[PDB]
């Protein structure tokens, strides 16, 4: 069973801006996803301090970067808190309506696209490089779900019968044809060092 949803008009607008604005500094997408992963890992870590059973779905708190040149995908995996069905539908747990509004106001007053993450809508920077994004997620309080969107105003949600993950979020970037540099090991290392050097969790870059 696949449910199709319309993005709120503001989010559809934000996505169209990201996809259609000329902006060469696309590499910032990765730091935005690593930042989201790090936030989700902080959440599970903090909740686990009063309830250790929250880590029964996995004790390791980490980030994996998985390039696949055959599929032309870059996948960002974490073992953070994950998201419920309600969170996914509600703009992947972001303050997207108010954040978009504030972001647009900032862009009028001298901000640029790289500042997207300051407004809580950094996830959408995935569309700088990806023609389609798949989000697989597992929260302790819910079952596993796949969110998907190629933009164009809509997204889908279905139950994911997996590859079960114990807990966390997997972001699969189906890269645009001209963005395959982000599958190269030396390029990924360079971007992690430039923008995400000092992060509170291990980042493992998988080799092919
Ligand atoms: C898709 C994107 C928004 C994203 C989400 C997560 C995620 O699971 N969460 C849950 C959570 C709880 C508190 C604070 C932030 C977050 C983000 C993720 O792990 C990675 C992502 O790219």
PDB file of C-alpha atoms and ligand atoms in Angstrom:
ATOM      1  CA  UNK A   1       0.000   0.000   0.000  1.00  0.00           C
ATOM      2  CA  UNK A   2       1.524   3.324  -1.210  1.00  0.00           C
ATOM      3  CA  UNK A   3       0.120   6.615   0.107  1.00  0.00           C
ATOM      4  CA  UNK A   4       0.742   9.749  -2.026  1.00  0.00           C
ATOM      5  CA  UNK A   5       0.804  13.176  -0.342  1.00  0.00           C
ATOM      6  CA  UNK A   6       1.140  16.752  -1.646  1.00  0.00           C
ATOM      7  CA  UNK A   7       3.886  18.909  -0.136  1.00  0.00           C
ATOM      8  CA  UNK A   8       2.582  22.034   1.603  1.00  0.00           C
ATOM      9  CA  UNK A   9       2.845  24.912  -0.889  1.00  0.00           C
ATOM     10  CA  UNK A  10       5.812  26.498   0.990  1.00  0.00           C
ATOM     11  CA  UNK A  11       7.847  23.239   0.830  1.00  0.00           C
ATOM     12  CA  UNK A  12       7.010  22.727  -2.871  1.00  0.00           C
ATOM     13  CA  UNK A  13       8.257  26.322  -3.370  1.00  0.00           C
ATOM     14  CA  UNK A  14      11.443  25.659  -1.318  1.00  0.00           C
ATOM     15  CA  UNK A  15      12.169  22.518  -3.356  1.00  0.00           C
ATOM     16  CA  UNK A  16      11.639  24.343  -6.686  1.00  0.00           C
ATOM     17  CA  UNK A  17      14.082  27.120  -5.539  1.00  0.00           C
ATOM     18  CA  UNK A  18      16.748  24.509  -4.650  1.00  0.00           C
ATOM     19  CA  UNK A  19      16.313  22.671  -7.949  1.00  0.00           C
ATOM     20  CA  UNK A  20      16.111  25.775 -10.215  1.00  0.00           C
ATOM     21  CA  UNK A  21      18.453  28.411  -8.661  1.00  0.00           C
ATOM     22  CA  UNK A  22      21.913  28.633 -10.273  1.00  0.00           C
ATOM     23  CA  UNK A  23      24.255  27.830  -7.341  1.00  0.00           C
ATOM     24  CA  UNK A  24      27.598  26.057  -7.932  1.00  0.00           C
ATOM     25  CA  UNK A  25      28.455  25.303  -4.275  1.00  0.00           C
ATOM     26  CA  UNK A  26      26.344  22.090  -4.195  1.00  0.00           C
ATOM     27  CA  UNK A  27      28.725  20.141  -1.892  1.00  0.00           C
ATOM     28  CA  UNK A  28      27.056  21.640   1.229  1.00  0.00           C
ATOM     29  CA  UNK A  29      24.260  19.004   0.872  1.00  0.00           C
ATOM     30  CA  UNK A  30      26.461  16.431   2.679  1.00  0.00           C
ATOM     31  CA  UNK A  31      27.124  18.501   5.781  1.00  0.00           C
ATOM     32  CA  UNK A  32      23.360  19.141   6.061  1.00  0.00           C
ATOM     33  CA  UNK A  33      22.598  15.358   6.099  1.00  0.00           C
ATOM     34  CA  UNK A  34      25.471  14.605   8.511  1.00  0.00           C
ATOM     35  CA  UNK A  35      24.151  17.416  10.763  1.00  0.00           C
ATOM     36  CA  UNK A  36      20.632  15.838  10.696  1.00  0.00           C
ATOM     37  CA  UNK A  37      22.166  12.405  11.530  1.00  0.00           C
ATOM     38  CA  UNK A  38      24.230  13.925  14.384  1.00  0.00           C
ATOM     39  CA  UNK A  39      21.041  15.603  15.803  1.00  0.00           C
ATOM     40  CA  UNK A  40      19.147  12.283  15.654  1.00  0.00           C
ATOM     41  CA  UNK A  41      22.107  10.518  17.374  1.00  0.00           C
ATOM     42  CA  UNK A  42      22.118  13.197  20.133  1.00  0.00           C
ATOM     43  CA  UNK A  43      18.388  12.524  20.652  1.00  0.00           C
ATOM     44  CA  UNK A  44      18.745   8.736  21.148  1.00  0.00           C
ATOM     45  CA  UNK A  45      21.870   9.243  23.293  1.00  0.00           C
ATOM     46  CA  UNK A  46      20.011  11.706  25.616  1.00  0.00           C
ATOM     47  CA  UNK A  47      16.799   9.571  25.845  1.00  0.00           C
ATOM     48  CA  UNK A  48      18.955   6.462  26.558  1.00  0.00           C
ATOM     49  CA  UNK A  49      20.432   8.177  29.688  1.00  0.00           C
ATOM     50  CA  UNK A  50      17.143   7.746  31.587  1.00  0.00           C
ATOM     51  CA  UNK A  51      16.030   4.589  29.693  1.00  0.00           C
ATOM     52  CA  UNK A  52      18.833   2.188  28.638  1.00  0.00           C
ATOM     53  CA  UNK A  53      16.256  -0.157  27.024  1.00  0.00           C
ATOM     54  CA  UNK A  54      15.973   2.511  24.207  1.00  0.00           C
ATOM     55  CA  UNK A  55      19.339   1.094  22.946  1.00  0.00           C
ATOM     56  CA  UNK A  56      18.078  -2.532  22.767  1.00  0.00           C
ATOM     57  CA  UNK A  57      17.624  -1.780  19.018  1.00  0.00           C
ATOM     58  CA  UNK A  58      21.420  -1.095  18.815  1.00  0.00           C
ATOM     59  CA  UNK A  59      24.082   0.439  21.079  1.00  0.00           C
ATOM     60  CA  UNK A  60      26.409   1.757  18.338  1.00  0.00           C
ATOM     61  CA  UNK A  61      25.880   5.462  17.577  1.00  0.00           C
ATOM     62  CA  UNK A  62      27.479   6.161  14.204  1.00  0.00           C
ATOM     63  CA  UNK A  63      27.216   7.437  10.616  1.00  0.00           C
ATOM     64  CA  UNK A  64      27.975   5.429   7.439  1.00  0.00           C
ATOM     65  CA  UNK A  65      28.546   6.939   3.975  1.00  0.00           C
ATOM     66  CA  UNK A  66      27.854   4.389   1.225  1.00  0.00           C
ATOM     67  CA  UNK A  67      28.629   5.231  -2.422  1.00  0.00           C
ATOM     68  CA  UNK A  68      27.433   2.882  -5.183  1.00  0.00           C
ATOM     69  CA  UNK A  69      28.620   3.702  -8.694  1.00  0.00           C
ATOM     70  CA  UNK A  70      26.513   0.898 -10.333  1.00  0.00           C
ATOM     71  CA  UNK A  71      23.222   2.320  -8.898  1.00  0.00           C
ATOM     72  CA  UNK A  72      24.535   5.896  -8.957  1.00  0.00           C
ATOM     73  CA  UNK A  73      23.459   6.366  -5.294  1.00  0.00           C
ATOM     74  CA  UNK A  74      25.057   7.939  -2.270  1.00  0.00           C
ATOM     75  CA  UNK A  75      23.524   6.621   0.987  1.00  0.00           C
ATOM     76  CA  UNK A  76      23.850   8.257   4.419  1.00  0.00           C
ATOM     77  CA  UNK A  77      23.005   5.815   7.230  1.00  0.00           C
ATOM     78  CA  UNK A  78      22.774   6.580  10.940  1.00  0.00           C
ATOM     79  CA  UNK A  79      21.633   4.708  14.083  1.00  0.00           C
ATOM     80  CA  UNK A  80      19.924   7.789  15.558  1.00  0.00           C
ATOM     81  CA  UNK A  81      16.440   7.958  17.069  1.00  0.00           C
ATOM     82  CA  UNK A  82      14.677   7.493  13.680  1.00  0.00           C
ATOM     83  CA  UNK A  83      11.203   8.854  12.815  1.00  0.00           C
ATOM     84  CA  UNK A  84       7.579   7.676  13.306  1.00  0.00           C
ATOM     85  CA  UNK A  85       5.126   7.597  10.399  1.00  0.00           C
ATOM     86  CA  UNK A  86       3.606  10.885  11.710  1.00  0.00           C
ATOM     87  CA  UNK A  87       7.056  12.572  11.813  1.00  0.00           C
ATOM     88  CA  UNK A  88       7.890  11.518   8.236  1.00  0.00           C
ATOM     89  CA  UNK A  89       4.613  12.906   6.837  1.00  0.00           C
ATOM     90  CA  UNK A  90       4.983  16.055   8.933  1.00  0.00           C
ATOM     91  CA  UNK A  91       7.956  17.236   6.789  1.00  0.00           C
ATOM     92  CA  UNK A  92      10.441  14.615   8.148  1.00  0.00           C
ATOM     93  CA  UNK A  93      10.275  16.132  11.660  1.00  0.00           C
ATOM     94  CA  UNK A  94      11.280  19.655  10.454  1.00  0.00           C
ATOM     95  CA  UNK A  95       9.665  23.087  11.123  1.00  0.00           C
ATOM     96  CA  UNK A  96       9.411  23.369   7.353  1.00  0.00           C
ATOM     97  CA  UNK A  97       6.580  25.926   6.990  1.00  0.00           C
ATOM     98  CA  UNK A  98       8.035  28.549   9.381  1.00  0.00           C
ATOM     99  CA  UNK A  99      11.666  27.660   8.533  1.00  0.00           C
ATOM    100  CA  UNK A 100      11.024  28.080   4.792  1.00  0.00           C
ATOM    101  CA  UNK A 101       9.354  31.442   5.420  1.00  0.00           C
ATOM    102  CA  UNK A 102      12.307  32.662   7.534  1.00  0.00           C
ATOM    103  CA  UNK A 103      14.800  31.242   4.982  1.00  0.00           C
ATOM    104  CA  UNK A 104      13.088  33.147   2.081  1.00  0.00           C
ATOM    105  CA  UNK A 105      13.168  36.369   4.150  1.00  0.00           C
ATOM    106  CA  UNK A 106      16.903  35.796   4.844  1.00  0.00           C
ATOM    107  CA  UNK A 107      17.641  35.201   1.129  1.00  0.00           C
ATOM    108  CA  UNK A 108      16.156  38.677   0.432  1.00  0.00           C
ATOM    109  CA  UNK A 109      18.462  40.220   3.093  1.00  0.00           C
ATOM    110  CA  UNK A 110      21.827  38.796   1.954  1.00  0.00           C
ATOM    111  CA  UNK A 111      21.680  35.079   2.852  1.00  0.00           C
ATOM    112  CA  UNK A 112      22.651  32.367   0.357  1.00  0.00           C
ATOM    113  CA  UNK A 113      21.559  28.718  -0.155  1.00  0.00           C
ATOM    114  CA  UNK A 114      24.444  27.348   2.030  1.00  0.00           C
ATOM    115  CA  UNK A 115      22.632  28.890   5.055  1.00  0.00           C
ATOM    116  CA  UNK A 116      19.597  26.570   4.530  1.00  0.00           C
ATOM    117  CA  UNK A 117      20.478  24.435   7.604  1.00  0.00           C
ATOM    118  CA  UNK A 118      20.280  27.457   9.945  1.00  0.00           C
ATOM    119  CA  UNK A 119      16.522  27.466   9.241  1.00  0.00           C
ATOM    120  CA  UNK A 120      15.842  23.790  10.042  1.00  0.00           C
ATOM    121  CA  UNK A 121      15.213  22.817   6.373  1.00  0.00           C
ATOM    122  CA  UNK A 122      18.678  21.503   5.408  1.00  0.00           C
ATOM    123  CA  UNK A 123      17.297  18.100   4.405  1.00  0.00           C
ATOM    124  CA  UNK A 124      15.834  19.679   1.233  1.00  0.00           C
ATOM    125  CA  UNK A 125      19.423  20.607   0.106  1.00  0.00           C
ATOM    126  CA  UNK A 126      19.597  16.898  -0.954  1.00  0.00           C
ATOM    127  CA  UNK A 127      17.850  18.122  -4.155  1.00  0.00           C
ATOM    128  CA  UNK A 128      20.987  20.163  -5.079  1.00  0.00           C
ATOM    129  CA  UNK A 129      22.466  16.781  -6.185  1.00  0.00           C
ATOM    130  CA  UNK A 130      19.658  14.186  -6.233  1.00  0.00           C
ATOM    131  CA  UNK A 131      16.873  13.722  -8.785  1.00  0.00           C
ATOM    132  CA  UNK A 132      15.154  11.403  -6.273  1.00  0.00           C
ATOM    133  CA  UNK A 133      15.535  10.884  -2.522  1.00  0.00           C
ATOM    134  CA  UNK A 134      14.451   7.802  -0.595  1.00  0.00           C
ATOM    135  CA  UNK A 135      14.259   7.991   3.220  1.00  0.00           C
ATOM    136  CA  UNK A 136      14.096   4.660   5.113  1.00  0.00           C
ATOM    137  CA  UNK A 137      13.510   5.069   8.850  1.00  0.00           C
ATOM    138  CA  UNK A 138      12.858   2.994  12.029  1.00  0.00           C
ATOM    139  CA  UNK A 139      11.858   4.529  15.367  1.00  0.00           C
ATOM    140  CA  UNK A 140      11.572   2.372  18.556  1.00  0.00           C
ATOM    141  CA  UNK A 141       7.845   3.305  18.856  1.00  0.00           C
ATOM    142  CA  UNK A 142       6.846   2.400  15.256  1.00  0.00           C
ATOM    143  CA  UNK A 143       7.589   0.045  12.345  1.00  0.00           C
ATOM    144  CA  UNK A 144       9.932   0.596   9.340  1.00  0.00           C
ATOM    145  CA  UNK A 145       8.823   3.111   6.618  1.00  0.00           C
ATOM    146  CA  UNK A 146      10.083   4.354   3.230  1.00  0.00           C
ATOM    147  CA  UNK A 147       9.464   7.988   2.250  1.00  0.00           C
ATOM    148  CA  UNK A 148      10.233   8.943  -1.370  1.00  0.00           C
ATOM    149  CA  UNK A 149      10.123  12.035  -3.653  1.00  0.00           C
ATOM    150  CA  UNK A 150      11.381  13.148  -7.029  1.00  0.00           C
ATOM    151  CA  UNK A 151       9.960  16.615  -6.109  1.00  0.00           C
ATOM    152  CA  UNK A 152       7.204  17.812  -8.522  1.00  0.00           C
ATOM    153  CA  UNK A 153       4.884  18.578  -5.571  1.00  0.00           C
ATOM    154  CA  UNK A 154       4.365  15.130  -4.053  1.00  0.00           C
ATOM    155  CA  UNK A 155       5.927  12.407  -1.915  1.00  0.00           C
ATOM    156  CA  UNK A 156       5.005   8.804  -1.112  1.00  0.00           C
ATOM    157  CA  UNK A 157       5.005   6.828   2.122  1.00  0.00           C
ATOM    158  CA  UNK A 158       4.843   3.011   2.423  1.00  0.00           C
ATOM    159  CA  UNK A 159       5.705   0.347   5.000  1.00  0.00           C
ATOM    160  CA  UNK A 160       9.244  -0.922   4.229  1.00  0.00           C
ATOM    161  CA  UNK A 161       9.578  -4.747   4.557  1.00  0.00           C
ATOM    162  CA  UNK A 162      13.338  -4.380   4.344  1.00  0.00           C
ATOM    163  CA  UNK A 163      16.344  -5.097   5.126  1.00  0.00           C
ATOM    164  CA  UNK A 164      15.121  -4.213   8.652  1.00  0.00           C
ATOM    165  CA  UNK A 165      17.345  -1.708  10.395  1.00  0.00           C
ATOM    166  CA  UNK A 166      17.414  -1.984  14.171  1.00  0.00           C
ATOM    167  CA  UNK A 167      16.866   1.786  14.543  1.00  0.00           C
ATOM    168  CA  UNK A 168      17.739   4.957  12.661  1.00  0.00           C
ATOM    169  CA  UNK A 169      17.496   6.691   9.303  1.00  0.00           C
ATOM    170  CA  UNK A 170      18.858   5.866   5.854  1.00  0.00           C
ATOM    171  CA  UNK A 171      18.875   8.644   3.200  1.00  0.00           C
ATOM    172  CA  UNK A 172      19.376   7.346  -0.322  1.00  0.00           C
ATOM    173  CA  UNK A 173      20.391   9.994  -2.867  1.00  0.00           C
ATOM    174  CA  UNK A 174      19.654   8.952  -6.463  1.00  0.00           C
ATOM    175  CA  UNK A 175      22.157  11.383  -7.944  1.00  0.00           C
ATOM    176  CA  UNK A 176      21.636  13.548 -11.042  1.00  0.00           C
ATOM    177  CA  UNK A 177      23.652  12.392 -14.064  1.00  0.00           C
ATOM    178  CA  UNK A 178      26.122  15.333 -13.819  1.00  0.00           C
ATOM    179  CA  UNK A 179      26.699  14.911 -10.030  1.00  0.00           C
ATOM    180  CA  UNK A 180      28.647  11.612  -9.929  1.00  0.00           C
ATOM    181  CA  UNK A 181      31.699  13.329  -8.356  1.00  0.00           C
ATOM    182  CA  UNK A 182      29.927  12.683  -4.976  1.00  0.00           C
ATOM    183  CA  UNK A 183      30.480   8.935  -5.451  1.00  0.00           C
ATOM    184  CA  UNK A 184      34.282   9.366  -5.603  1.00  0.00           C
ATOM    185  CA  UNK A 185      36.112   8.382  -2.441  1.00  0.00           C
ATOM    186  CA  UNK A 186      38.547  11.323  -2.548  1.00  0.00           C
ATOM    187  CA  UNK A 187      35.711  13.818  -3.154  1.00  0.00           C
ATOM    188  CA  UNK A 188      33.649  12.531  -0.209  1.00  0.00           C
ATOM    189  CA  UNK A 189      36.731  12.599   2.089  1.00  0.00           C
ATOM    190  CA  UNK A 190      37.475  16.146   0.966  1.00  0.00           C
ATOM    191  CA  UNK A 191      33.932  17.376   1.735  1.00  0.00           C
ATOM    192  CA  UNK A 192      33.760  15.625   5.154  1.00  0.00           C
ATOM    193  CA  UNK A 193      37.090  17.261   6.096  1.00  0.00           C
ATOM    194  CA  UNK A 194      36.045  20.697   4.750  1.00  0.00           C
ATOM    195  CA  UNK A 195      32.557  20.901   6.358  1.00  0.00           C
ATOM    196  CA  UNK A 196      32.065  18.044   8.883  1.00  0.00           C
ATOM    197  CA  UNK A 197      35.586  17.541  10.386  1.00  0.00           C
ATOM    198  CA  UNK A 198      34.668  17.682  14.085  1.00  0.00           C
ATOM    199  CA  UNK A 199      31.435  15.742  14.697  1.00  0.00           C
ATOM    200  CA  UNK A 200      30.572  13.864  17.922  1.00  0.00           C
ATOM    201  CA  UNK A 201      30.115  10.473  16.176  1.00  0.00           C
ATOM    202  CA  UNK A 202      32.258   8.215  13.951  1.00  0.00           C
ATOM    203  CA  UNK A 203      31.776   8.586  10.214  1.00  0.00           C
ATOM    204  CA  UNK A 204      32.727   5.550   8.121  1.00  0.00           C
ATOM    205  CA  UNK A 205      33.210   5.944   4.401  1.00  0.00           C
ATOM    206  CA  UNK A 206      32.535   2.564   2.738  1.00  0.00           C
ATOM    207  CA  UNK A 207      34.747   1.517  -0.136  1.00  0.00           C
ATOM    208  CA  UNK A 208      33.589  -0.118  -3.335  1.00  0.00           C
TER     209      UNK A 208
HETATM  210  C1  LIG B   1      15.412  13.145   6.422  1.00  0.00           C
HETATM  211  C2  LIG B   1      16.174  14.035   7.401  1.00  0.00           C
HETATM  212  C3  LIG B   1      15.234  15.064   8.029  1.00  0.00           C
HETATM  213  C4  LIG B   1      16.895  13.193   8.443  1.00  0.00           C
HETATM  214  C5  LIG B   1      16.210  12.750   9.580  1.00  0.00           C
HETATM  215  C6  LIG B   1      16.830  11.933  10.525  1.00  0.00           C
HETATM  216  C7  LIG B   1      16.068  11.541  11.750  1.00  0.00           C
HETATM  217  O1  LIG B   1      15.735  10.377  11.918  1.00  0.00           O
HETATM  218  N1  LIG B   1      15.811  12.511  12.687  1.00  0.00           N
HETATM  219  C8  LIG B   1      15.118  12.246  13.958  1.00  0.00           C
HETATM  220  C9  LIG B   1      15.514  13.430  14.796  1.00  0.00           C
HETATM  221  C10 LIG B   1      15.246  13.697  16.135  1.00  0.00           C
HETATM  222  C11 LIG B   1      15.704  14.864  16.712  1.00  0.00           C
HETATM  223  C12 LIG B   1      16.428  15.770  15.963  1.00  0.00           C
HETATM  224  C13 LIG B   1      16.694  15.516  14.631  1.00  0.00           C
HETATM  225  C14 LIG B   1      16.233  14.343  14.041  1.00  0.00           C
HETATM  226  C15 LIG B   1      16.374  13.866  12.624  1.00  0.00           C
HETATM  227  C16 LIG B   1      18.165  11.519  10.315  1.00  0.00           C
HETATM  228  O2  LIG B   1      18.777  10.701  11.219  1.00  0.00           O
HETATM  229  C17 LIG B   1      18.850  11.921   9.175  1.00  0.00           C
HETATM  230  C18 LIG B   1      18.231  12.753   8.243  1.00  0.00           C
HETATM  231  O3  LIG B   1      18.929  13.168   7.152  1.00  0.00           O
END
